Amino acid sequence: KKPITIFGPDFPFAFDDWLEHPAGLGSIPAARHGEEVAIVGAGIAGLVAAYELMKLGLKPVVYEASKMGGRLRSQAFNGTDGIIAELGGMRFPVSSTAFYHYVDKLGLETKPFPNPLTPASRSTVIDLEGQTYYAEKAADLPALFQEVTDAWADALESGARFGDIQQAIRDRDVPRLKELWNTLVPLWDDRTFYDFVATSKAFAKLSFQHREVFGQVGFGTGGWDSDFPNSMLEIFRVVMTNCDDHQHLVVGGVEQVPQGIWRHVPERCAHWPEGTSLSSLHGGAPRTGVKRIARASDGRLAVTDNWGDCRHYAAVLTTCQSWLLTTQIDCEESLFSQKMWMALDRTRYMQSSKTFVMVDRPFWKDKDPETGRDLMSMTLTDRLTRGTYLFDNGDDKPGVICLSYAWHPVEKRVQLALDALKKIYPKTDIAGHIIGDPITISWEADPHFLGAFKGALPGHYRYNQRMYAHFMQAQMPVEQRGIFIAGDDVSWTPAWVEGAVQTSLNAVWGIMNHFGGKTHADNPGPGDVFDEIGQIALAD
Amino acid sequence: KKPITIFGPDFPFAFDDWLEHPAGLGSIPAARHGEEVAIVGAGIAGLVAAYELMKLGLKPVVYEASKMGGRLRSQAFNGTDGIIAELGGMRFPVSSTAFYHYVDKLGLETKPFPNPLTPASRSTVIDLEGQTYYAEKAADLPALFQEVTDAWADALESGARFGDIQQAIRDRDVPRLKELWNTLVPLWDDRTFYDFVATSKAFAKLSFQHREVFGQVGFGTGGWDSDFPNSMLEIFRVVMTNCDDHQHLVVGGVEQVPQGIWRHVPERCAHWPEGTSLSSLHGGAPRTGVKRIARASDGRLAVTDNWGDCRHYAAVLTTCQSWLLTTQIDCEESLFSQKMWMALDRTRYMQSSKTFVMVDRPFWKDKDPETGRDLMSMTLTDRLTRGTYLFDNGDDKPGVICLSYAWHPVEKRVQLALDALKKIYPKTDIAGHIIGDPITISWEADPHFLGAFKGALPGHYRYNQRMYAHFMQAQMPVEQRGIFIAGDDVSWTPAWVEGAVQTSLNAVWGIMNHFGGKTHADNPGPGDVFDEIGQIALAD
């Protein structure tokens, strides 16, 4: 079978084909080469856009208020050479084909993520209501977990035509894909993942306890409870495009992606001398934080940094979490329509915490001979810690444990997790193996950021659709043209890096178009097919 | 008309009748008079329980980790006599008849709260997507508001038999109320208020805008969007018992209720000398914060305070937000069943902010000669402030403005609200009337609180039901008897003080029962009718 990819459903454009075609993304009239475009944010969406716009012969000017890379952030443990904790995104589904274009272009290595019940994990432990279940494969788990898995598979088949949608994604059958998906949009926009579960016949036939299990740990590979309040459409998108499985980690830390894009010399650029990179063009560093964006009296856009320095541009792309545009960035009211402002004000963000320790070796691989069990496993629980992941860097290098994912000082956070993990594994001495420093993150603190990523709110498809289409500007008044937005808040998969890359590439098409440029006839880009296969607009 | 009171629907017991009966609440055998019972928390739930158990001849020992009153908290502005800002609860629906029992006992005065479109408010302004609507009566508003109003009424009437339930409430007809309510519980437990509105016929045939207005400002009396994620059963309870209307403020500040209960000499009391109050029994102050609760080897409960002092009690009642029992307070595992632990672990809390200024006089009552509009009104908006309240203390006295009630230093909070109000009232100089200090509160920022109050989660009716029933301990193993819980998270109306009072009175019943007491035959209490009319248990 042809692979599942993040191909629609909302906009089934082949971003991958577009990036891979030998013709390139398009061209800008040479009279405009060298002109500047401001890009606010040096996370993956800002840098992908800057890189491709550099290749088209413009001079991107990246601004960054905090650290290069944004929410792709990898921290080395003290003393070590490349043993990292992932502070932002860490598990990248292979269906993320536009993201992996850049990973592959940089020649970075990836490996399978140690998810429960996969080849990359030896064993799993589920701890619920004080009972522990050990499993080396899914069939080791008690029947109740398979019942949960069947009820979920049946709910998605009955409720959303999961099988048909996946096949149309595999085949890239756009007409069929849009027919299946567009039926679901007005049905499920207004309804939570809570409501999908509670009105599905398959979950209704199971005991309450089964629905609880499903929220805490799913069928044994990860719970759903943090997603229950969100729009069911968001959950459909996730599961239909395999975001939630077949995931890889980037060896040496995914921060190498935006750091490598910064430094990478394209083989072929319009206008620039051979050897040019984003880094070259900038004299080595992005500009500082943006505090104001305004329309200048010459009709160009005015961008003022934190220190009062104000520079003019024909186009500005903002990739900070989009709610900062309403408060933090003083962005001139005439720059967005009233309805765009309303969509921008309404975004809400989910919060997350992860704490990592380093260990001297992957001791979890040892066997307890009184039981046959690994000393420790990928752990899913209803307790504090929720999920614990084990990273085997090889038998004779340090391991890393993500002691706690979930949705006090570092020292207290780690002690609380080790106490909970002692309840679950009363015979294993985890503490004894820990070395170096603990690394903790909460995205909340710092800001600059509002949360790990947005939670798609029921009833907000209309706002999402207006923001997603913002790059299509032929019909907008001249006072609203020339500013562009991208990043994972803009995208249909807000928790997943491929959303940030796809919306970024839509913005690249938009900006190219803005400068009088166009795609090559044999390699059309997002704005060439958007009106025909773009996301449906709902009435009112 | 017989009034609507907070009489069920889940537990339709007349707590008001039980308090007002001249027989009193019951009695405990003389041999047990003077024995101590620990009460953790000196909010309204802890003090009402302490008060009534003192009357029955016990020696309550109240512990308080922060301030007396809990979330009933009233702060005076600098240098004034009796001019207050209400930091916790401020508007108390007169359906709250058990709370008002204590307000009245203490001879406190109340007045109508200045809610929009009521006689206590002269005018309202609604400000939505950049447009302003002035109204001195509901009919001044454009037709969109009356359509939302009719839709909500039709939705409740159609989907929940609201008219019939309210009539059963007014009549105190228990069999009819339970028949109407019990049918709703399994239908709506696991659906959100989002889902209820979206799927209702009456909103489903109106434009998107109508639902959006409903979320932001309702039909002109306050928006509902902060309750959208909650179980629809919670919202039924609130509207069916009139929690959201006919509200009064306590003159001089609602904190006088718990401070007064503390000092009040009861009109009858077993065991204690004439003139005894909670305050005299305690020698003036509650004990400090509790750190640990455990079962001692003599079979009693051991309560260890923050400074390590340990004391034994035959019963302990806890009234802090009940999730603290899982974390801040080290509460011995064997004290709750596994199922009670699971209910306790699951509660989640809503967050709140309010900022108040004092003004020199009630200037908003001045007319603008031009437009005929008040200078300022009760203001509902989609802007940051969300709601602004105006408190008239008489023409010759300072006024108070609640500048923002929504769901940062104080100076930046006030400045940002004044900037939003300038956008709405570009001709009114609010700033020029402000005197004294700005008073703000965020409940989350204090560590003895997790939020303003819980939000009821879809699907948690089974947990709610088990925690509400925990005071009924005939069927429990010995090791789980003698500890009790009460407070607003325990109740069916978790954002309303009447829930804290009613759950506290169930606990009083349970504690009197624990000490071998009982109610008088002519005044039965909650535990005497619970098994028959208490809330329905759902099956697995």
Next chain:
Amino acid sequence: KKPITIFGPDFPFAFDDWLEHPAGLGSIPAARHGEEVAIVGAGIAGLVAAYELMKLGLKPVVYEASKMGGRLRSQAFNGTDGIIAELGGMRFPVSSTAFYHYVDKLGLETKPFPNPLTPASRSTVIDLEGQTYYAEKAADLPALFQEVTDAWADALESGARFGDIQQAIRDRDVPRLKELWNTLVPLWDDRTFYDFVATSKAFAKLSFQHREVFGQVGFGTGGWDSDFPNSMLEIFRVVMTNCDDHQHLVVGGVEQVPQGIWRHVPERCAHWPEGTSLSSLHGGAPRTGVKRIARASDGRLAVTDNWGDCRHYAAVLTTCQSWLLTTQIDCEESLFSQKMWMALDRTRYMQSSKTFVMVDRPFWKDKDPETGRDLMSMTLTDRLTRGTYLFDNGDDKPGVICLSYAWHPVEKRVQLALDALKKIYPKTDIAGHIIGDPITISWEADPHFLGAFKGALPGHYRYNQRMYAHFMQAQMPVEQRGIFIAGDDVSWTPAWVEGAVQTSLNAVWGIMNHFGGKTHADNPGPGDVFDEIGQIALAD
């Protein structure tokens, strides 16, 4: 002997006589009655000035950014009626005759403070280097303490003519006082209290251990180590005017002083209707925080509050800690001479912490029969706590303990003190007696404040002298006249409330003078004698 008072040495003006004389402080021409004078700060210096200027027929307009009373701040423990912890100043030497004028005028009660080795304290314990010394009177202490006391008495006699200065203060012999003091000013301005100790023959003849004792606990009544880095002149002033002994507490909390001044009706006011008070004149509350002071184009002074409200005044008195004028308050550069700005920029502040608990009764009064010792005493130590004070509110009301004075959360601060006090008193159970809530303060946090009070820096007499004389404005250019400063940073006794009151009364004379007013011939005020007996100016 006639009593020691805070009478000079630097400006030996009888503030007390001036306040007490039946003529009053002076008068302003009636044509200026009712005109406004801005006063920034509602601590004791702002309110004393406002009160007296109201009496002269002006309309003071008090501004307050934080809480009325400033660093006189008394907090009731929860549940109690008037059992207070003192958060600011708590021990007021009776030599503070201008401060006590207001205490007496308000009819507040005072009582002796429980200082070590005084009639108000039963016993003292000194704990040093792990040895404990118990004493009910000074002679119980080992010889080493009397040796320290003699060496200090001899150092002050030899080095500073302590005896002669005290006699000239008792007699109020101004010529002699100024002759003795003015010799010391240039000698000791540049030298620390460190240096005075290390070059004195009396300390040189003692072992090192004796000098250490002196810094930690003095001769048994309080150590000096926190004062060692300061200008020796400041220490002279303190000891010569008995600031450091014969101290009283204000019953019910010293915050009653500025709160009572706010509400007090003078018997005799110029201009105002009978019954006028500061509170009346203000409609009940001071204005909010000041953010800007500027010179207006009409020549008057412009005062802008935090909310942008800007009002004009003929005169402004600022009493916030004076360093806020340089940063926080945007105060126009033309308002102060260059040399005044320099004096204002150079002030530095000392930091302090105090933690208080309430206890059920004054248990410390109980005797240990195995030893004859009180269970607990006023405790001086080199450990964390430094000093612990015991407040006996009567055998049958709660006691208060100041567990820790010295120069983490509250819970941790109290635990750390109880642990240290367990080392010292291994047999006493303090914890068991503690009730209510702990009250802690650090002045640092909040700001508004820079520290508890300024530390007089060696070599800064010239800056102190210019700021002290700032109220004398006949010789200043018209652009620098009309603004005035007062408060304890301005005063010669920065750690002591009488400094704030004296500089305030100098400002009252200044402002009166500014409005064309004068003192009565038979009751001359500070500015009438300042040029003749004011603080010496040093050359350069």
